[PDB]
Amino acid sequence: PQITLWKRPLVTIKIGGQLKEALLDTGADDTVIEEMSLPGRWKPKMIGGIGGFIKVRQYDQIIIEICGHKAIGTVLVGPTPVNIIGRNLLTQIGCTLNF
Amino acid sequence: PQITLWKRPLVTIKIGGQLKEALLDTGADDTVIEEMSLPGRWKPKMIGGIGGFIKVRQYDQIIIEICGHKAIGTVLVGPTPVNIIGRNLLTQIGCTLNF
Ligand SMILES: O=C1C(=O)N(C(c2ccccc2)c2ccccc2)[C@H]2CNC[C@@H]2N1C(c1ccccc1)c1ccccc1
Numbered sequence: 001p002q003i004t005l006w007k008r009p010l011v012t013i014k015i016g017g018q019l020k021e022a023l024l025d026t027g028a029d030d031t032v033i034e035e036m037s038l039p040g041r042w043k044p045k046m047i048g049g050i051g052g053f054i055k056v057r058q059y060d061q062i063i064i065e066i067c068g069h070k071a072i073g074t075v076l077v078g079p080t081p082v083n084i085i086g087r088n089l090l091t092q093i094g095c096t097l098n099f
Numbered sequence: 100p101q102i103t104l105w106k107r108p109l110v111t112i113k114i115g116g117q118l119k120e121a122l123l124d125t126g127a128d129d130t131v132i133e134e135m136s137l138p139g140r141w142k143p144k145m146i147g148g149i150g151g152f153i154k155v156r157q158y159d160q161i162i163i164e165i166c167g168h169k170a171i172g173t174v175l176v177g178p179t180p181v182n183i184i185g186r187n188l189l190t191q192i193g194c195t196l197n198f
Pocket residue numbers: 023025026027028029030032047048049050051081082084122124125126127128129131146147148149150179180181183185
């Protein structure tokens with residue numbers, strides 16, 4: 001699809017058997033999801049943005065389905081106010097910026 | 100152009116005759132630039148970042164060139180890790196997400 005930017009580019013994602021609403025975020029290096037459980041090993045990580053840093057759990061090799069496109073990558077889990085799909089997964093679904 | 104997302108989508112912008120670097124940021128509602136001098140009156144604005152809420156200075160009707168494209172719109176001045184061009188100006192230059 002072609003998604004305009006008059007409003008937040010929110011899409012439905014499927015992660016760890018759950019459906020969530022997430023933002024397609026070209027300004028985010030990483031994908032950050034609100035608190036949930038995911039299987040496998042994790043390690044703590046600190047990520048910083050507007051308003052400072054938050055502590056997250058880093059899970060690697062996690063499959064997500066984004067608008068019907070499946071991708072795999074690292075997912076960070078922690079107190080983000082909005083679920084964010086960052087560049088590490090946007091590349092995998094072939095998402096580009098065009099003007 | 101078409102900008103892929105394997106690297107950060109950093110571009111040159113021009114504001115007040117000076118070149119700066121900024122991220123094309125679809126996850127940002129607003130455009131947020133690090134402390135600099137802008138003309139005119141400003142008013143207060145609170146934005147909710149990933150790390151929490153911050154107060155910034157809102158300047159309206161600011162002339163800004165982004166990757167060669169002229170925009171005239173709202174710029175917020177405040178502590179951000181990287182200058183970010185948000186949806187308010189991405190729409191002005193005709194930017195869409197595509198996959
Ligand atoms: O406020 C931010 C924000 O903090 N970031 C961070 C960031 C860091 C790490 C992971 C994800 C996000 C950031 C990254 C690079 C440069 C500057 C800041 C922004 C990345 N792209 C948009 C994101 N917005 C949004 C936002 C989105 C969801 C929930 C809260 C905030 C934003 C920015 C400005 C105005 C409105 C929303």
